[PDB]
Symmetry: C2
Subunit: 249 residues, 2 copies
């Protein structure tokens, strides 16, 4: 089942081309319905925090954080490039990378949850583009500016509630050209193991977002570049890079 | 004035020993009042994120930064009964090098994006106190300081925020089990509060009620289960917190 957030933070379930509004994620229908093209798609979550895995394609998962300010609206499939929220090419970097990833939206609070019970706390899966500024990532104290600058996390188009996270494909296309491709069965740490690990020291709240890592093929980006990340059984995330920004003031 | 959050996420202003409830932070009074001793003090903010500064007391060219998730927030001890109300910070199973760092904390009032240093402070709602709990061992080995700085309860915050203050003219003092361990004058900050907020805003938009930590003075030492911590910031207040028993295997 596809669950989405749209317009002024509304929730709904996608029924073909019809968006059936619900009271809360996957909740009872309110009675309103909208044509998919007529709504403004939003990241399918309202996270208190975003936890991301490093190399996943290490005795334990490497983790880093992104603030919610990194979230960027996904392009509406009915009009991709005309609606996707642009990721400004930062003035502080010159090594901007992209990383297509499978993303997890937590459904139930998780604290000290064993691997075998981890997926039961998942609301659904969605797609993300972990934007990275590699040049500052090497010289900064921590990856704050490198991974958590504004819009460094396009997320969407919606989440799928029924899926086998360890058996799906992630394909990233840059300007129509396939640049990344990977099978989640090749994950060093499974989604379940990742969520479980995190829960040992950090409680995951309902609707928090967890990035599962990026496959091989990470390349550079240029202003104007158009990205398309398709994840079998989930959906396709459309996002693009905006023009180079100048000095802040 | 002193603004606080209490009970079921209610906001209020402090007058002596009375908490006067308001509609939002510093908002209109509702007409309800409570005795301080009768309410459950909460961290004075509901941050979308917590941005922290690294070394900042007397050298880096730019402020070093790191994040903490809201899960790190821990209730401040109520000044009317400190040790009996403060939310304990469990001594984690994953570390054996837990350290304390008392710090001045800032609570953002108005959204900040590309704000120059000279306009920074005008966007501040107020100032409060914090203890940046740190697990030093994992901090050296892990990929990033996630469990080193963002483990549950790694951020006691409170007791409340002060709206009227000169951030660069106050003292931060940390006491452990009745003994002074840290003492720093904020005028000795490498980066001023205004510069820190400004810097952050050049790439990261700060939302209303986000929290920003401004670094810690010398005196960072090791903690032990049962330690009673007090961080006093002149003109702001005193944050009371404590370390709980060491935890064992997660499951």
């Amino acid at each position: 089942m596809k669950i989405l957030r749209f317009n002024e933070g509304r929730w709904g379930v996608l029924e073909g081309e019809l968006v059936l509004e619900t009271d809360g994620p996957g909740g009872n229908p309110t009675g309103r319905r909208y044509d998919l093209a007529s709504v403004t798609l939003l990241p399918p979550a309202t996270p208190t925090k975003i936890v991301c895995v490093g190399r996943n394609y290490p005795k334990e998962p490497g983790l880093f954080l992104k603030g919610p300010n990194a979230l960027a609206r996904p392009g509406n499939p009915r009009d991709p490039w005309g609606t996707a929220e642009p990721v400004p090419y930062p003035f502080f970097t010159e090594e901007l990378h992209y990383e297509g990833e499978l993303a997890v939206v937590v459904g139930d609070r998780m604290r000290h949850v064993p691997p075998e019970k981890a997926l039961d706390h998942v609301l659904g899966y969605t797609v993300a583009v972990d934007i990275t500024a590699r040049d500052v990532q090497k010289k900064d104290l921590q990856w704050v500016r490198a991974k958590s600058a504004d819009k460094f996390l396009p997320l969407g188009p919606w989440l799928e509630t029924d899926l086998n996270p360890q058996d799906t494909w992630v394909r990233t296309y840059v300007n129509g050209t396939l640049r990344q491709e990977g099978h989640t069965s090749q994950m060093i740490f499974s989604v379940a193991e990742i969520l479980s690990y995190i829960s040992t020291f950090m409680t995951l709240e309902p609707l928090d977002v967890v990035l599962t890592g990026t496959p091989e093929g990470v390349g550079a980006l240029r202003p104007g570049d158009r990205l398309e990340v398709a994840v079998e059984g989930v959906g396709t995330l459309f996002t693009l890079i905006g023009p180079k920004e100048e000095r802040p003031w």
